[PDB]
Ligand binder design. Structure first.
Ligand SMILES: Nc1ncnc2c1ncn2[C@@H]1O[C@H](COP(=O)(O)OP(=O)(O)O)[C@@H](O)[C@H]1O
Ligand SMILES: [Zn+2]
Lengths: 573, 78, 229, 169
């Protein structure tokens, strides 16, 4: 059709008026010329630039991708093959075959959607979907164009294969058995090495449980990956995918529940205010900043200030250290709580899930078991904080396997066959109750909880909390409940700002105090909640770094070590 | 034969000669039909150094030599 | 539709036959053919360094020649039969029914390619994750660990039939030979395994080494077919 | 076959942390790997042997959690003599508090997290890339000792052999 050429010209005009895209192509060509690895034939186009230049073409792509994108594909391919000479004869006949793909970015407006917000009214349109990748399939190539050669004639004839799973518009069904004879009847020769192939993979993007509504079945979408972006995300990755939400097959129109197979032809993959900054920084200048953020951790829960302080430090976290030797160092802080019930053990454990940017609340499966191997509860915890209740209920396998996660922050699969290493950069907080119904302060926590010292001591801070029979505790603990008969969103922004925009580093002045106190701890023979080892020295570094996160400073000062040492003694005495 | 194993074909009066768990010596023809390699079994069996042995048989240190020879890397333990 | 690809096999076949006869070790490959003629050798191991040296000798003398070394790597499936045709043209019913030899190629050595100032790709050790679909039909080297080994299996290539009505042998139910086609009566085709072409076949799965796997993924596997001796 | 921890580590090194927690079905298989470098499996009618050429490096905490100087050493392991006999260079890294030793370790570790270097300035260790080549090259050699030291060994063995009779009691 004639209108197709006009739409092609608009993209050519779009490329002309925005030199950034075409000069980037020229830079890519120069890079390929210097290597004459080869970069793929894909560039990214901003939708905002297209909208500001031609709304109808921009709207046409979103509403009718099959009728507006292929004109852009032809325009880009024609410009690429004509911007330079492509001098090499043999290489030009093969390297220039690949059509130049397009990728999209920018604001999507009404089409910025989720697997649940996406509906059938948006089908056969271009949409952007944000979700979590659940599983993927093996990459396999797609046949695009074949080349035929007759021995008796010595000349080449080419044939194309297209299908609706990769073609934007529904073309006449091409696929068939490979031909054997040409027009003249001469036997043809199958030139495997001159056929063009494109890799293909399907992924299953799902709505996150973090945002799913309660009591409703999930929504998920199938996404097709092609060519160069065929492998960009692993299962569990939070991804943003732009593609043509399109139907397949038939809903029983030919030859009952069978519906049209709606899925997205993915063409782009992206893995996932100033006033808030002017507020977070401003409020930190007062002398009592740290106590403010400790009170706002479940304010209705009375007491337990130090554990709230420890939880906040765990949320801020330390800095994992890497070296040119390839070493990795622990930077996460783990806390375990023990004692008699009815002391808000699970209340604060529940509160952490309500405060962290990402958190997983489960109970004592933890590791990947067997095939893709399912991602265990501790496996899915990367870059998050873990809330486990009934921590005593761990089985023998869980108790012996949690050691690697606790210290190395890594999950190692060593099952029969596949071996792999999975990131487990997670801070673990847990609570437990005595087996014998009541806690005995006359005996150590190892003799009460029945978890081995080799497991209990791995937690940096072990809190033993017991409600005394003293009346003054009973008065306050009951009055605070009866009294019920800086904002939390700001606090969560503060944690988001601190964990990303500031990375504190050590200083010899802090070392002067940290090493001194550890030396005193090793020298002090008085009984304590845990025997002092080198782990406490690492804990002090993490705690001081965690406090530096609160102060929003790239360096470390004396007060950071003073607070870290003081709190550590509290958990030990 | 080894833990591999291949299928065999038996005809005529060679039936009632093999049962599960038996050990067999086979003389037969190797075939292949579409790939399916198999044996046209043609027969089935189910069941100078003599002086050198005598020279060792009548010797005096026979028992010690045989006992020692079994484990040359292991001392004594007669 | 048609397009003129600048690949002239006529020039290449002349170069291949010239390389077979002229390239001295007398000629290395002609001596190998003499060994093959006396059944002393079953596998012809073509060295791509030998062809590259031949091109270098041709280039330094100013003689015109094509870049045969690159062509063989790019379309190695087609050149497998071309080298056989040249070898059959110079060795001391379809020919494949009597060929007792098997053809193999070994890649350019990196020392030689660097010496001749060329970017060898054939000998580069590749992991199955680096093996994209773009490299289909190319000559590549795969580095990994073997996980599965299929046992030796026969593999037919050309099935031979015999017709009692005319005595012709048909190479692939009813005889399609010229005598039976013209005649009103056609003979029945009976398969003959003795004249059929068979090859030894095995299949092996290669798996990525530990250092090749990026963090968070699973070591993929690739299938390898082994044919001949 | 689907390779486990030991089979994958064939012609390599297998590290087993928390070795004291290993079950009897785990440790009994360790005996054959330590002694024979092979694994014999007879299950579901399959009778095969696997190559298990592995170097076993196990690190574990004491049986009673920690070591106190009053405790006898053999009571701090859950392992019988057969496993301890199959080990070589059996270490025992006891931790004893000391103001002159904890100071050095603390200073060593605190410099590791402070700068991207080892605390030593007079010595620069070999980078792993060069270490791998030298170890591989060294591994290619096959030294053979002399008869003089061969007679030396049997004297030193008897020296060490006879002492343990007094030491054990
Ligand atoms: N300091 C406190 N302030 C307010 N409520 C508390 C406090 N301590 C305990 N409680 C109350 O006691 C109850 C016990 O919860 P919790 O101790 O978490 O259960 P469990 O003992 O089973 O873990 C909670 O519902 C909580 O409201
Ligand atoms: Zn006939």
């Amino acid at each position: 059709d004639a209108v197709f050429g006009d739409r092609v010209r608009r993209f050519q005009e779009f490329l002309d008026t925005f030199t950034s895209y075409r000069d980037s192509v020229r830079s890519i060509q120069v890079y390929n010329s210097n290597n004459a690895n080869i970069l793929p034939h894909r560039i990214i186009i901003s939708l905002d630039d297209l909208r500001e230049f031609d709304r109808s073409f921009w709207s046409g792509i979103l509403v009718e991708p099959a009728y507006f994108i292929p004109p852009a594909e032809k325009a880009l391919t024609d410009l690429a093959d004509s911007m330079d000479d492509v001098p090499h004869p043999n290489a030009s006949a093969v390297s220039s075959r690949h059509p130049w793909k397009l990728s999209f970015k920018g604001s999507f407006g009404a089409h910025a959607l989720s697997p649940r917000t996406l509906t059938a009214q948006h089908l056969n349109k271009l949409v952007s979907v944000e979700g979590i990748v659940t599983k993927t399939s093996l990459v396999r190539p797609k046949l695009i164009r074949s080349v035929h050669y007759a021995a008796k004639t010595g000349r080449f004839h080419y044939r194309d294969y297209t299908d609706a799973t990769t073609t934007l518009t529904t073309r006449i069904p091409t696929p068939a058995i490979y031909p054997t004879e040409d027009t003249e009847g001469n036997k043809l020769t199958t030139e495997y090495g001159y056929s063009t192939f494109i890799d293909h993979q399907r992924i299953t993007v799902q709505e996150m449980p973090e945002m799913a509504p309660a009591g409703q079945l999930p929504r998920s979408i199938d996404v097709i990956l092609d060519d160069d972006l065929v492998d960009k995300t692993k299962p569990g990755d939070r991804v943003n995918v732009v593609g043509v939400f399109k139907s397949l097959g038939a809903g029983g129109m030919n030859q009952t529940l069978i519906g049209f197979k709606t899925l997205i032809l993915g063409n782009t993959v992206y893995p996932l205010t100033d006033f808030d900054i002017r507020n977070i920084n401003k409020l930190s200048k007062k002398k009592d900043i740290f106590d403010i953020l400790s009170q706002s951790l479940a304010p209705s829960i009375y007491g337990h200030d130090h554990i709230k302080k420890a939880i906040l430090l765990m949320l801020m976290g330390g800095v994992e250290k890497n070296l040119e030797n390839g070493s990795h160092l622990r930077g996460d802080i783990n806390i375990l709580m023990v004692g008699d019930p009815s002391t808000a053990k699970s209340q604060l454990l529940r509160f952490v899930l309500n405060t962290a940017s990402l958190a997983i609340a489960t109970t004592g499966g933890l590791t990947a078991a067997v095939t893709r191997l399912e991602a265990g509860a501790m496996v899915l915890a990367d870059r998050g904080v873990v809330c486990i209740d009934e921590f005593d209920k761990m089985t023998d396998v869980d108790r012996v396997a949690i050691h690697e996660v606790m210290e190395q922050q890594t999950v190692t699969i060593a099952k029969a066959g596949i071996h792999t290493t999975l990131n487990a950069r997670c801070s673990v907080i847990a609570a437990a109750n005595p087996v014998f119904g009541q806690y005995d302060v006359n005996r150590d926590p190892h003799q009460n909880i029945a978890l081995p010292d080799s497991l209990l001591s791995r937690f940096d801070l072990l809190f033993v909390v017991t409600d005394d029979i003293n009346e003054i505790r009973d008065r306050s603990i009951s009055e605070h409940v009866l009294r019920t008969h800086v904002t939390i969103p700001f606090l969560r922004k503060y944690v988001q700002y601190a964990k990303e925009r500031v990375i504190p580093q050590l200083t010899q002045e802090a070392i002067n105090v940290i090493v001194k106190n550890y030396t005193d701890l090793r020298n002090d023979d008085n009984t304590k909640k845990s025997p002092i080892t080198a782990r406490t020295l690492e804990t002090l570094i993490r705690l001081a770094t965690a406090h530096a996160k609160v102060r929003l400073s790239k360096t470390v000062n004396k007060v950071d070590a003073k607070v870290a040492a003081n709190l550590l003694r509290f958990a030990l005495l | 034969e080894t833990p591999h194993s291949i299928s065999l074909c038996v005809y005529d009066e060679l039936v009632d000669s093999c049962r599960a768990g038996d050990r067999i010596e086979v003389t037969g023809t190797f075939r292949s039909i579409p790939y399916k390699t198999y044996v046209d079994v043609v027969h089935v069996k189910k069941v100078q150094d003599l002086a050198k042995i005598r020279e060792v048989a009548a010797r005096e240190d026979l028992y010690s030599l045989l006992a020692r020879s079994i484990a040359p890397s292991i001392y004594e333990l007669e | 539709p048609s397009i003129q690809l600048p690949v002239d096999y006529n020039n290449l076949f002349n170069e291949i036959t010239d390389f077979l006869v002229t390239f001295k070790q007398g000629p290395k490959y002609m001596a190998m053919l003499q060994k093959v003629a006396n059944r002393e050798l079953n596998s012809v191991i073509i060295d791509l360094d030998d062809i590259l040296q031949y091109q270098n000798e041709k280039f330094l003398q100013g003689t015109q020649a094509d870049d045969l070394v690159s062509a063989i790597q790019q379309n190695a499936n087609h050149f497998t039969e071309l080298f056989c045709r040249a070898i059959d043209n110079n060795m001391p019913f379809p020919p494949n029914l009597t060929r007792r030899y098997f053809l193999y190629f070994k890649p350019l050595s990196q020392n030689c390619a660097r010496r001749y100032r060329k970017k060898a790709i054939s000998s580069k050790p590749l992991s199955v994750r680096q093996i994209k679909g773009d490299f289909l039909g190319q000559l590549i080297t795969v580095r990994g660990i073997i996980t599965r080994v299929s046992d030796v299996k026969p593999a037919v290539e050309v099935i031979a039939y015999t017709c009692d009505q005319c005595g012709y042998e048909v190479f692939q139910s009813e005889c399609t030979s010229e005598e039976c086609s013209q005649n009103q009566t056609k003979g029945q085709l009976f398969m003959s395994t003795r004249a059929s072409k068979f090859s030894a076949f095995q299949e092996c799965k290669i798996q990525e080494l530990s250092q090749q796997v990026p963090v968070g993924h699973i070591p993929r596997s690739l299938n390898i077919h082994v044919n001949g001796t | 076959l689907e390779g486990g921890a030991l089979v994958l580590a064939d012609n390599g090194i297998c590290c087993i942390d928390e070795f004291d927690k290993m079950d009897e079905s785990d440790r009994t298989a360790i005996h054959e790997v330590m002694e024979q470098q092979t694994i014999s499996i007879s299950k579901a009618g399959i009778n095969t042997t696997l190559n298990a050429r592995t170097s076993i490096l196990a690190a574990a905490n004491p049986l009673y959690g920690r070591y106190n100087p009053r405790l006898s050493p053999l009571d701090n392991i859950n392992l019988p003599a057969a496993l301890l006999s199959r080990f070589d260079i059996l270490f025992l890294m006891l931790d004893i508090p000391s103001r002159d030793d904890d100071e050095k370790l603390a200073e060593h570790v605190t410099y590791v997290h402070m700068h991207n270097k080892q605390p030593d300035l007079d010595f620069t260790p070999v980078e792993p890339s060069k270490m791998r080549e030298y170890i591989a090259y060294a591994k290619t050699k096959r030294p053979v000792m002399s008869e003089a030291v061969n007679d030396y060994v049997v004297q030193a063995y008897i020296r060490l052999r006879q002492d343990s009779k007094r030491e054990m009691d």
